[PDB]
Design a protein around this ligand. Structure first.
Ligand SMILES: Cc1cn([C@H]2C[C@H](OP(=O)(O)O)[C@@H](COP(=O)(O)O)O2)c(=O)[nH]c1=O
Ligand SMILES: [Ca+2]
Length: 129
């Protein structure tokens, strides 16, 4: 896979963000994770966590996987990086998202994220508390 540039337009929630990519505004849905909706338990904390990670970053990147690059809603499907740290993994490692939505062909970072989830679960963090 390859990191590509993007710039933040706006935080949305724990697993969606509005970024400018190839010069066009797009909503991105983070691959392989599910954060609680804002109205759910830990939804606010997941939103805040992503918000802070993307707003503080000097360099935002997106990395598409091998399969579908946009979902049925027109959302881009990517791994997002903030100053070289993957937001998808960071959310899981902190117990603020579950590994989820693992479709064949867009699952390159599956095992990295499951390893993170195991550790968040061991530590009883957030969702796992
Ligand atoms: C993460 C992801 C979600 N989606 C679709 C599946 C779900 O369909 P439904 O809307 O029919 O439930 C929805 C979940 O996204 P959200 O968790 O943002 O709601 O997005 C994909 O198609 N591919 C993906 O890789
Ligand atoms: Ca969600």
């Amino acid at each position: 896979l390859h990191k590509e540039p993007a710039t933040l337009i706006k935080a949305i929630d724990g697993d969606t963000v509005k970024l400018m990519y190839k010069g066009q505004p797009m909503t991105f849905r983070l691959l392989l994770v599910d954060t609680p909706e804002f109205n759910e338990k830990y939804g606010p904390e997941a939103s805040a966590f992503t918000k802070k990670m993307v707003e503080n970053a000097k360099k935002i990147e997106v990395e598409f996987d091998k399969g579908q690059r946009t979902d049925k809603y027109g959302r881009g499907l990517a791994y997002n990086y903030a100053d070289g740290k993957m937001t998808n993994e960071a959310l899981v490692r902190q117990g603020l998202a579950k590994v989820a939505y693992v479709y064949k062909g867009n699952n390159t970072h599956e095992q990295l994220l499951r390893k993170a989830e195991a550790q968040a679960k061991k530590e009883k963090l957030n969702i796992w508390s």
